[PDB]
Symmetry: C3
């Protein structure tokens, strides 16, 4: 009752912490990937600038 309510609130809080932890991990991986493409574009710009007539 109070105990079931409190039990439910605890479990939902644990669910929400688990959900933000998953988002944090996916966002960390996305930011890493964006760093990788930044590198790739930079290399393509360097190339093109070196090849420029």
């Amino acid at each position: 009752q109070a105990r079931q309510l409190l039990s439910g609130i605890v479990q939902q809080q644990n669910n929400l912490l688990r959900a933000i932890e998953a988002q944090q991990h996916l966002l960390q991986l996305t930011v890493w990937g964006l760093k990788q493409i930044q590198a790739r574009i930079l290399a393509v710009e360097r190339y093109l600038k070196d090849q420029q007539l």
Copy 2:
């Protein structure tokens, strides 16, 4: 008092869930965005390889 404290905590829990659901949509947009630029850079890299002398 118990009822007011527990109502405030339950309402906040719903508020937090809502905020995390909004950040999920944004996060998936960043994942989609990274995917689209990945494809675009790969398409350039390949063009530049194909066109080289």
Copy 3:
């Protein structure tokens, strides 16, 4: 135990709140960064279409 448990729940709500605020900022920075790379790839694509 209930007042201590309630105290813990409320502290964890405040800390969830701070984590959501920090992830808002990181998402915003990540969007900005994406938009910057999109523009750079767009400029490359237009340059290449012009030299074709």
